[PDB]
Design a protein around this ligand. Structure first.
Ligand SMILES: COc1ccc(-c2csc(NC(=O)[C@H]3CCCCN3S(=O)(=O)c3ccc(C)cc3)n2)cc1
Ligand SMILES: COc1ccc(-c2csc(NC(=O)[C@H]3CCCCN3S(=O)(=O)c3ccc(C)cc3)n2)cc1
Ligand SMILES: [K+]
Ligand SMILES: [K+]
Ligand SMILES: [K+]
Ligand SMILES: [K+]
Lengths: 144, 348, 348, 348, 348, 144, 144, 144
């Protein structure tokens, strides 16, 4: 875990860019605009509130490490993703069409690049009348 | 395969007027067979019903076993239950266990007790037991268990306090009444057990009258007990009724939450993006347009996008509240203040 | 014609102090005749009341038949019921059916049973049956049916669970008590029917005491049953009471919704505009001031004006909620942001 | 005069620990005298209590009459009750009537029945009747009457439906049971009156057991009636309890409304201004600084100031609601839009 | 010292699965010993249980006394209870008193009644009394007392009205029934006490049936009483249940109030600042950067900072409400208006 | 009542100042600013909503006449004023001090000219230890 | 229905005026201002939300066709219009005056041209003491 | 108490600065800005509302004296402070760490000067594994 905190402190140094040891909303927005994204202030606020437990408005390095620590391949996260698919499931049998999925990835919420979805579909066995088992995806992307 | 899911919906996800008539008729025939189980106990009709209940039992074991295997096949529509181990998982669930037990035990008692006392003694209990077949997905019991778990502290409180009141008050009634003799000559309260029987029958407002106190101490205590303890065995009705109602209504109003769709999509998208990050050869890198340390920061930002999307989704499914109004008002208000200050400076 | 609607309001849409006294007096005379129906069953007074109930019946059949035809005429004020087929539609409704049945059957039993056992056996039931005459527009029964339909799942749940508890617990009490003999020598529980009788009388907290268990198994089971099942036949009170109250209060607060007036007007207006669109010779075209394709686009815009007005109206009648506050806040807030940005650009 | 209001507050607007102990002790002595009224009816103690109740009665008539006149004098603090006709208005109110009746009738029965059967027959009822003395301002009965009037429709509904169920079901039970004979040889249901007695005792869940049906039709009907009608004589508890609670809580939270003070002041001020307008020689004209028609317009504006202040005050006393939030948001939002447009034009 | 608090949490602040099993097992052994106290009263088993209950009592007195001293030592983790006088304060609290009484009286009755009637007569009551040992922190009784105190007016209202109804109605039933004779020859209502017994048993819906009225006046009164008074001894269930539920739910939702942390900190800080003000040599003066009168004004401002922080904190712990929304909206709205006016002037 | 509607139509002509037959919020605010008052827009809105029953936002002459018609010396208005005094009544006996009343008239809500209150006090018999019976005022100013 | 979609695609081409296949709020507002109407932005937004089921903010041609498809002569629409009349019905007998109706059409909500209402009245048998049966209108304008 | 009101009137003269006898929000903000603090308007409003009982918006000298009069060493104030500590108490035993306390004083709410906290800690017996009994502080700063 020493290499882990070495890499995490390296990562925190990118945002810090100071001996501050904290990150402010702008201090994140600058790094994001460096990539050509253009977030909103409300976006960065809601972003930042999901890391701190101090209620200050800034991320101390322990909180940054804490966010790193907790795992995506989780009991609860898996079920949340699974429940999210079910909104788009007609008949609730555990299957969804292909073209419907492509329609939903590329239009609703954060729209995706077409090549991204082209990759996404072919991760799963899409044949079989075009249906796909979405728990296959869930097991895939909760494998880490 | 369309037919398979179609019959699954017919049997196991019912809706409409055909499905309803089917499940209705099933309920009615099982109830009728129960009434023959009743009338088998009466001496006048113990012969008629006893014979009738041997042929209807055969009819029913055939019918329910058939329905069982049809259902066990039709469960391949669900992806949980595809495959052999899937069907095994289907047989594993409780209602299927009960159905199977009923079918097999019917068949056994018929094939054995053909040539028979314990036979019919068991038949009657199977007839009773078959009523669990009706509720298929257990929404009944699930509702109950939910409301009990939510309101567990209240109910334990009532049970404790009422129990104590019963115990104490019944001891004192025993002491006051242990030597009293009835008009018919007998002693109602010989023991503390009898006083507890009295107390149970009383505090819960049944009043058989098999045991009544005669003395003035007993009547005094009983009056006060009867006025001040009975409530604690009547609260659960109010509690559970309000719980049932609230649960149903909110589970219904949850249907009209339409904001959850983009939240779900965003959650999915950012999750898969976090995953595909772990393949540097992926095509999710082209969105940003060399990359000594850009890798790490992108991964970090995506992870926290995932977390915020997760919380937003988890709250997208719940009803709004005043707290949310206040939060958004303050947020937008301060945004507006900083913006008008910004313009105020841009002029200068 | 003013008089016609005036008497309609007197009989069928009552309000005030005169109407109330009228309907009151009607209720009182029918109740008195019912009490004579009661006392006709007693041997001492079976002669007095039996004769009295032959003259008051004549009085009443005249009165109620008169009132019936007056009402059937006066219903021409309503446009549903204008015309012959209108009055037929009036006679078709349930309360009018009941009134007619009572009147005619009274007349028949009098004209026939003049010169008489089944006569009075029927008279008593008619006296009972006349109490439906009181509630005119059935707001009572409508309230009940509404609240039952809303809360149907909860009530089915209670009925199912309580039923099951009864069945099982009574079987076990039967097994424990079937051979027990009472002090008076008789067997209370000979059959499972008797145990079901016991269970019904118990779980619902009546406790006649005609059947009590003697054994320790029976008393144990009865105690546990009595504590843990009685609630499921007492929930409906809480449910139905809360439902009644809520329904009445919201149906009352609906009176103060004054926003619905312009919504109604707008709905009407845009609907008729959509209709009159279909006549190109109409005068709704002058509002726009040649027209190759303007026809279609105008029609489309009007259709969707109609739809939005329809939804606005349908929501203009319901009480506000936090969700609406949030929606309007976000909407106005973003409008304000874009406006201040607009000015921010107009300066530059 | 300070003392006068001080004792008024002691007797009639109680608060603290002294007042409470006083009213408590009064309650206790009247209760004790009631228990002697009880024990006067028992043959063993009919002598002791009968003599005791002749001296305590004298004590009490002196005490309560004294208290009555003290109170009637002390009511001059209130301006309603200043003056002779004021004190008459005080004696006019119900609780004072009851107090006076008790005192005078006690005195009369003592002075007459000194030298006595109807005497003590009346004494017992006076002892019972004195319990109304406790609640002084009737907040108890006022709360009840309020909650009944609010919930009148619900309660009439229950009473009607339960009544009907009773009537019908009891007729059918009568028909089924009229010839049945009991184990002891007697007929429980000779008449429809007896069946109504049964029904009342049953539907309200008392179950004395003096009348039970024997037949299978009777038991069937009774079971169904018992399951499906009992609720309608148990709703009022839920209704009335929720009403009591809500009323008390809102009447308490009304204490924290501090906005009503300026509203009250403004109402007073504009009302008196409207009045003083009617004197042209008044000094309210100097606020405006000849006057051909200014008179009328000033009067009009003031009248409508009065009306708006009146409504604002009437709503200043009630709790806020979502509708008010929405109204103020829309109002302020549109004000802000017109203001920013105004600035947008002032630049150009 | 870590171990000390660890065992304190085990005994007195329980949580988990080990602690639960422990307290469970304790409950079970005390219940079993109670059942032997029960069966000691029965003649068949009065020997077996009587001997068993002499050895289990020794076991238990050892166990509970040990647990008591362990706990009394372990309470040094709390700072209330550190020191000798601390442990005395621990022994002072009620549940500890009860535990001690049970232990000592057990020991005494054993050491004395070794060589014994009043002995076991006391043993039975101790077995009953030991059930208070279970709830450790009294959350049960605290919940009850809270909900009663909140709803005290409603409950007094019910008790008063129901009491009165009982008294009056029972007097009239007495008058109507005092001379009536039963089938068995006896007089049910000889005295007003008997009628009160009847009334209590009736109005609360028990109905033993030991006393029933025969006359028509009695039955009339009883019917009306039974319909219209029973509710007032059934309201408390609804009241108390709703209270329990509300209290628990809000005490749970209070966990998610995260705004209270900075409020708490600010309160602490400004309080200590106010204190340290009183030392002119303090270091809180350097924040302001000679001082003839600056001392006073600083102290004043700090005192009122303290007061505002105090109120903010006291309201930071309570749930939001519409009133707060309205206040903040108005406040921010007027701030925004004055700011836009300010800019409107800065341009000009 | 013919003279009454003559005077009321005369009065309505002052606000109309047009053949409109209605009054708009500004069309009232102008007449008020002619007197040197300076109301708020919200004031005029809340003012105007207490006269119309059309929901339009303007006062038709029938509504103006209706406002004229209904009487101040009323069962309900009297009780409302009486209840308003009770907010300022310590001990609820039907009496209030003099100086307290002067303090409340001149400070809270619409502040009054001192001469107005000087007239107001002397309308009632203020002697008797300074107390005054406020129902005397209520009977006075509900006499019309 | 082929001629129906031909005419509907013709109609959609008027709004599209592009190979976009969608309509934006402005892309509708322009067509409306071409007619001399001058809607509000909020108007066009609320307008457009009653056609889409995508949640995007634009109308795809399937959604346009869907709006075309569903029928005015409906079970529910009829009852809604009927209930709307009842707001203006004194005594609830199913009749309303003539002049009241003219007053309401020409003043409240979207005011109408006088000639429009002059046509509207004469569609129904207005004689008979001036009353009119409004369900006659409802049957008329739900006949399509 | 005569010397007490002399000093309090002296103190009120600092804020008054004119023969007004009252303090307005600005009339307080000026005195605060004289010290180099820069409060907000909302701050001064909420500040001032905790002194008056008139509802006017200003502090009369009796209200100022009233605020002076009521005592900090109180039954209720003590308990409020005690409850405030409990938010920062893990395990609820009546003890809190030292460094945790320093962290909370210097970061959350009104941040303090480091020298202030350095003084604050040493007021109490901080030894004993670093724990401190916070009711000791409460008794200290409620001693006045
Ligand atoms: C005084 O404090 C109390 C009192 C009661 C409760 C409480 C909550 S849920 C509940 N019963 C019940 O949940 C149901 C189900 C579990 C057993 C008890 N009853 S069953 O007899 O109808 C019954 C019995 C047998 C069968 C086959 C079906 C149904 N009882 C809680 C606290
Ligand atoms: C089934 O539908 C129903 C059933 C009941 C009600 C209902 C509302 S209020 C109410 N009783 C009551 O309000 C009280 C007071 C009025 C008489 C009836 N009870 S009293 O006997 O306790 C009683 C009797 C005599 C005395 C001196 C004091 C108290 N009863 C409403 C609807
Ligand atoms: K009962
Ligand atoms: K009972
Ligand atoms: K009973
Ligand atoms: K009984």
């Amino acid at each position: 875990t020493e290499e882990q905190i070495a890499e995490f402190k390296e990562a925190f140094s990118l945002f810090d860019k100071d001996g501050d040891g904290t990150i402010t909303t702008k201090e994140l927005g600058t790094v994001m605009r460096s990539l050509g994204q253009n977030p909103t202030e409300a976006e960065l606020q809601d972003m930042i509130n999901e890391v701190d437990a101090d209620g200050n408005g800034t991320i101390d390095f322990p909180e940054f490490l804490t966010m790193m620590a907790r795992k995506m391949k989780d009991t609860d996260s898996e079920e949340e993703i699974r429940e999210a698919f079910r909104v788009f499931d007609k008949d609730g049998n555990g299957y969804i069409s292909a073209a419907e999925l492509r329609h939903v990835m590329t239009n609703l919420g954060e729209k995706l690049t077409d090549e991204e979805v082209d990759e996404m579909i072919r991760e799963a066995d899409i044949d079989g009348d075009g249906q796909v088992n979405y728990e296959e995806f869930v097991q895939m992307m909760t494998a880490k | 395969t369309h037919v398979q899911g179609r019959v699954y919906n017919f049997l196991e996800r019912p809706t409409g007027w055909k499905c309803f008539v089917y499940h209705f008729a099933v309920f009615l025939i099982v109830l009728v067979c129960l009434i023959f189980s009743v009338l088998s106990t009466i001496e006048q009709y113990a012969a008629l019903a006893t014979g009738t209940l041997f042929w209807m039992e055969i009819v029913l074991v055939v019918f329910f076993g058939t329905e069982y295997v049809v259902r066990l096949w039709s469960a391949g529509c669900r992806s949980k239950y595809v495959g052999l181990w899937g069907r095994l998982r289907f047989a594993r669930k409780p209602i299927s266990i009960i159905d199977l037990i009923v079918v097999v035990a019917s068949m056994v008692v018929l094939c054995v007790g053909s040539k028979a006392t314990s036979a019919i003694r068991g038949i009657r209990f199977l007839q009773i037991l078959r009523m669990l077949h009706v509720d298929r997905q257990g929404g009944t019991w699930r509702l109950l268990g939910s409301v009990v778990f939510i309101h567990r502290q209240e109910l334990i409180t009532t049970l404790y306090i009422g129990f104590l009141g019963l115990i104490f008050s019944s001891y004192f009634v025993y002491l006051a009444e242990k030597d009293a003799v009835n008009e018919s000559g007998r002693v109602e309260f010989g023991s503390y057990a009898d006083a507890l029987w009295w107390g149970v029958v009383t505090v819960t407002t049944i009043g058989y009258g098999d045991k009544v106190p005669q003395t003035w101490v007993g009547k005094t205590i009983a009056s006060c007990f009867s006025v001040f303890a009975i409530s604690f065995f009547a609260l659960p009705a109010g509690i559970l009724g309000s719980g049932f109602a609230l649960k149903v209504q909110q589970k219904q109003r949850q249907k009209h939450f339409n904001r959850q769709i983009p939240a779900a999509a965003s959650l999915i998208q950012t999750a898969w993006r976090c995953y595909a990050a772990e393949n540097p050869d992926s095509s999710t890198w082209k969105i940003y347009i060399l990359r000594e340390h850009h890798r790490a920061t992108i991964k970090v930002i995506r992870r926290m996008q995932y977390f915020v999307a997760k919380k937003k989704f988890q709250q997208a499914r719940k009803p709004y509240d005043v707290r949310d109004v206040i939060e958004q008002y303050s947020q937008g208000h301060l945004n507006l203040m900083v913006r008008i200050k910004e313009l105020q400076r841009r002029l200068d």
